[PDB]
Paper text:
In the homodimeric ChCODH2 structure, the active site C-cluster is deeply buried on the protein surface, distinct from the B and D clusters. In this study, we identified the viologen interaction site in ChCODHs (Ch, Carboxydothermus hydrogenoformans) through systematic alanine substitutions of aromatic surface residues, which disrupted enzyme activity.
Relative to ChCODH2 WT activity (100%), F41A exhibited a dramatic reduction in activity (<0.01%). Unlike aromatic F41 (WT) and F41Y, aliphatic F41 variants (F41A, F41V, F41L) exhibited less than 0.5% relative activities. Consequently, we deduced that residue 41 near the D-cluster constitutes the pivotal site for viologen interactions in ChCODH2. The observed loss of activity in F41 variants of ChCODH2 prompted us to consider whether the alanine mutation affected more than just electron transfer, potentially influencing the properties of the adjacent D-cluster, including its redox potential. To explore this possibility, we carried out viologen-free electrochemical studies, attaching the enzyme variants to an electrode to observe any changes in redox potential. The results showed no significant difference in redox potentials between WT and F41 variants (0.28 V vs RHE), indicating that the F41 mutations do not alter the redox potential of the D-cluster. Furthermore, the structure of the F41C variant showed no changes in the FeS cluster environments, including the D-cluster. Thus, the diminished activities in the viologen reduction of F41 aliphatic variants are likely attributed to disruptions in electron transfer, affirming the key role of F41 in facilitating viologen interactions and electron transfer within ChCODH2.
Author numbering:
A (entry chain A), B (entry chain A): 4 to 636
């Protein structure tokens, strides 16, 4: 079971699933081997009904697609479509938040409001909207309008790109025509240009993909902005993670997916429903988190994270998960089938995200509170049905310090320097206490023993004094193995990093260091790390491709992770990916993505499947950046 | 060679290609056999980096994707993405025309203007824009604004759907939530909902696809509207088709692709460049058409159609094709490679559609005339280089009567009834002289002997008195085999159809019938057939799913054809497809698309690979519609 997951709680539930005959994601993976190699390397195209066209990576015919598409055109078109799909996900999430905010301030959805008015005003200022003498409702209306306008062409380019990166970075990108004109505009142009008999030049196609990845960044940054306005900017919190946060005697309710628009309501509403839960024989309602909507409510409310990504089925295998409340993205549709074995009530809430066999509750922001109680009453009912059943919850959980928004990080640092908060961080980079910064992002992947790449790479960077930040299921992986527990700083961190984390923590009244890894939130909250890195660049007066900052999508799965990896490259970062993206069938495309893009954006992909080697390569990229600034390393 | 193409000119050029060693689309197809069956049936998914997930159509494991996605979810997601890609193509084309028109009336592009002011006023009226007391420039500005607004969410749904179908049809579609909210909005939502861990219910997914197909119809109808305003509504024309329209002693210039924004300029500009061509030793510039941009200039100017679709390479094999001017869509990228063997200058003109090895001229509407002369001078240069070379142009061509816009058809019929022009058509349907109407649409496919399905089905419907209309490469197939020559009416048409075609032709001063098949234009001009069918429904006071009208994508290839087939079903038509779409791996999806969608929209797919059987099935669908209206059959 160790070959499947490094998580001990997951290993325990795999044994339970095996002996009960419940098929898991790892069993379905085993049944899929040997997997198709052509697809695995990108050398397959089904973009017209003359296909499928497959090209063998090596040997004899076929060597080109039926229409004449070369290996490099086929690879580049496939990648562009996956970038577009990721952008469509992150941007659909942000779009729903934009409508939610507009409804809130237009009197239509009273469950929603401007919770962070400071953030609302900073956003409108960054965008050029008038704060002085305006009602907040009017300002927010304008912010929601600008958000929605960024999806289509207009007289300005996408503002959630051009106003969030330094002007020098926007200049480099404009010179190559990489600034998106509109988020859904770019998505559609990708789908056009990659369709049969259209763009057939690898470099032309990949430049389009870089631009579409920036549309994805815009949607990430928009999603983070709008959720912070609506639900509050995260500040440091203390909670727990892993399966042991489930409680046999409570109504256990998982919130799962990405969009917190209803799950934030679930959180507050469940608190009111406590006595109804006690009346049913439970101690209360225990809301827990799965995947990114779990990260959202962890970041803002301290909701414990139950599990993540590849291992999400294992929460139900405990037999104690009474409800799983779903919005969209990264939900294994197998949960609907597994629910008949485990008694879990699986509920979908989003019109465009249903699963055959799951109960559907038509969530509307206008009825959110009523929708929540209906869903939670179903969870209470399910708890009743299992009264007296035995459950198997692994008694395994870790302590998690999280809530490090960029505002929270700046405030932590400001306790060492009130009017130049970034200076103590830069000082410690300059003097070597902080070698550099690494962002871990993205998913788990069934092909990688769960969390193995995240923890292996994390351990080696921390020993080398890298400041490590994390989002999404990268944060999930690190949090479930103790990397967000300050009591582990001594074991994990180099001497220089320990001193800095300790200096900041002791200045924030903690009497203990910051945690070894800073949890910056969900997948769209990768945009928080961009805001921190951009503010660092603006403070140093250099572009991002000169900073000792790198990114690692160490166990990437989703098309969203591919989009994120691509805009990290596009804004200038060396970007590790720890799973093979479908590009190895074309050396020209690989050479563009890992070498010659350096001369366009300054960033580049690092494809490395061995986690110890990936750590060496990330350190080398960090150190090259250090030497380029004249620093020691 | 007969197994490859039923076109004798194509067969002759295949022999030339074989003996010169030039590899063709049919050779590349042969090298691809046996093709992957899983892909061919839809049972493959690469929507995340855990894949590819393939399911065998029959037998043992694997039976589900790694994430739990069933065969029916995988099939439905793949189809939805192909519908989205088609919509992205048709809508990108329309979007470029919208910008071209706005530039024209804003004084920025003097090569462009309002050529059809009657059409401009009818469009603004259909949309609710004020004609009275407004400059045409102001009206056109508003029309272009409404066009661009239909790409994103707003207070109205997509007007190029809701204002072009009968209100009863819009009502049926609204009741199922099928009206698009915005063209690129729907494209992106498809890419979201089909990404990993999102929509996982076949019926939910296919309803989304129906709605996205209507976004494709909107883009088709927008493209036709804007091109008619800019370049004139087609009226009946006489020309020729097939390779024999090339002339050894002229500068032969093919316009190839879909968007006529530059090719219409090529047409008029080439006329001015005649003496420069004579000075070079040519008789002049012989502009000819390939694929849909060829259909555009044929419909409006009588430009001869040289060839279409699967056989486009064969035009260059003559050795007489001096330039091939490309915009986007359905261009085999092999033309760039074949050009080094044939001396052809291949020129791309669109920023998002380049081909490695082709000369690129950066067309801008603001410099269109200058761009045209530069491209045409290159064609003159290439003619010079081949002065004295032998060429092999097959002396094979057919006579083509075309230009039957819906306005042209209504005007033809109005010579039999001036103030009720649709009545003579309906009368002859009622009394049986016209059994019904069939629209042939879409591509050639290398898997089908070129034109075999179009002509076989056409021959049997015409003998049964079906009024046959055609667009795109369906029109190309029928025109190259004599189906647009009135001299063939006697051979091809039933007695009832002959009498009607003769009655209309003799009323239009022709002294001869209309041609056996009415050429309604390019692929976006499938929207013309919708306008005719909707006007027929509105005249009879019934919905489209009660009319004896059917559609046949007899040799479908492109994702655009899949979108078109799907919106024909969605507006209510029995819709034949003569190539296997990737759906046979899921019986539930097949059953939805061919049977139970009947209860939603009234239309349905007819999947039939044998052309004689497909003809019987189309006739049966026509006759069922006849009996439902109480008519004899
Ligand atoms: S677009 Fe080209 S390579 Fe792709 S399936 Fe069609 S013929 Fe094959
Ligand atoms: S989305 Fe599901 S079925 Fe598709 S490749 Fe990923 S794991 Fe496989
Ligand atoms: S041949 Fe396997 S992915 Fe297409
Ligand atoms: S396994 Fe052949 S299309 Fe994927
Ligand atoms: Fe996740
Ligand atoms: Fe074509």
């Amino acid at each position: 079971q160790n070959l499947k997951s490094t998580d001990r709680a997951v290993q325990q539930m795999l044994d339970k699933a095996k002996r009960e005959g419940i098929q898991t994601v790892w069993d379905r993976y085993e049944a899929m081997k040997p997997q198709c190699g052509c697809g695995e390397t990108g050398l397959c195209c089904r973009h017209c009904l003359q296909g499928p066209c497959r090209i063998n990576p090596f040997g004899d015919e076929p060597k080109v697609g039926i229409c004449g598409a070369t290996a490099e055109v086929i690879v580049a078109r496939g990648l562009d479509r996956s970038i577009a799909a990721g952008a469509a996900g992150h941007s659909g999430h942000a779009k729903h938040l934009a409508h939610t905010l507009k409804k809130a301030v237009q009197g239509k959805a009273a469950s929603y409001m401007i919770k962070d008015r400071t953030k609302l005003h900073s956003i409108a200022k960054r965008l050029g909207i008038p704060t002085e003498g305006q009602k907040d409702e009017d300002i927010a209306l304008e912010v929601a309008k600008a958000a929605l306008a960024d999806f289509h062409e207009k007289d300005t380019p996408v503002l959630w790109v051009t106003t969030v990166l330094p002007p020098s970075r926007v200049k480099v990108l404009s010179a190559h025509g990489l600034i998106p004109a509109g988020i859904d505009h770019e998505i559609a142009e990708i789908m056009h240009r990659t369709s049969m008999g259209c763009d057939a030049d690898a470099q032309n196609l990949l430049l389009g993909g870089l631009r579409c990845s920036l549309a994805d960044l815009a949607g990430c940054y928009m999603g983070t902005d709008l959720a912070d306005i609506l639900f509050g900017t995260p500040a440091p919190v203390v909670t727990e993670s892993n399966l042991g946060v489930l409680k046999a005697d409570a109504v256990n309710v998982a919130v799962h997916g990405h969009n917190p628009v209803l799950s934030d309501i679930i959180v507050s509403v469940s608190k009111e429903m406590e006595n109804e839960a006690r009346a049913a024989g439970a101690t209360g309602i225990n809301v827990v988190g799965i995947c990114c909507t779990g990260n959202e409510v962890l970041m803002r409310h301290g909701i414990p994270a139950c599990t993540h990504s590849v291992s999400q089925e294992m929460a139900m295998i405990t037999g104690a998960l009474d409800a799983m409340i779903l919005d969209y993205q990264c939900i294994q549709p197998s949960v609907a089938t597994i629910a008949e074995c485990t008694g879990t009530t699986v509920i979908t809430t989003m019109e465009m995200s249903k699963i055959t066999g799951a109960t559907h509750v038509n969530f509307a922001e206008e009825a959110a509170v009523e929708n929540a109680k209906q869903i939670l009453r179903l969870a209470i009912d399910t708890f009743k049905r299992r009264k007296g059943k035995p459950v198997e919850i692994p008694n395994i959980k870790t302590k998690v310090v999280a809530g490090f928004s960029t505002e929270a990080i700046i405030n932590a640092l400001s306790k060492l320097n009130a009017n130049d908060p970034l200076k103590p961080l830069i000082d410690n980079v300059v003097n070597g206490n902080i070698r550099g910064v690494c962002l871990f992002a993205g998913c788990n992947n069934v092909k990688v023993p769960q969390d193995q790449n995240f923890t292996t790479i994390a351990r080696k960077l921390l020993k080398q004094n890298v400041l490590v930040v994390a989002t999404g299921c990268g944060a999930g992986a690190l949090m479930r193995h103790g990397f967000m527990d300050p009591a582990n700083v001594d074991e994990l961190c180099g001497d220089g990093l320990k001193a800095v984390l300790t200096a900041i923590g002791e200045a924030n009244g903690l009497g203990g260091p910051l945690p070894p890894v800073l949890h910056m939130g969900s997948c769209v909250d990768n945009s928080r790390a961009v805001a921190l890195v951009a503010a660092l660049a603006n403070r140093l007066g250099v572009d991002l491709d000169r900073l000792p900052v790198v990114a690692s999508a160490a166990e990437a799965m989703h098309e969203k992770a591919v989009a994120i990896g691509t805009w990290a490259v596009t804004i200038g970062l060396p970007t590790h990916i720890g799973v093979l993206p479908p590009i190895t069938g074309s050396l020209p495309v690989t050479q563009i993505l890992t070498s010659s893009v350096k001369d366009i954006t300054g960033g580049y992909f690092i494809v490395e499947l061995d986690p110890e080697t990936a750590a060496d390569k990330l350190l080398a990229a960090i150190n090259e950046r250090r030497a380029g600034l004249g620093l020691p390393w």
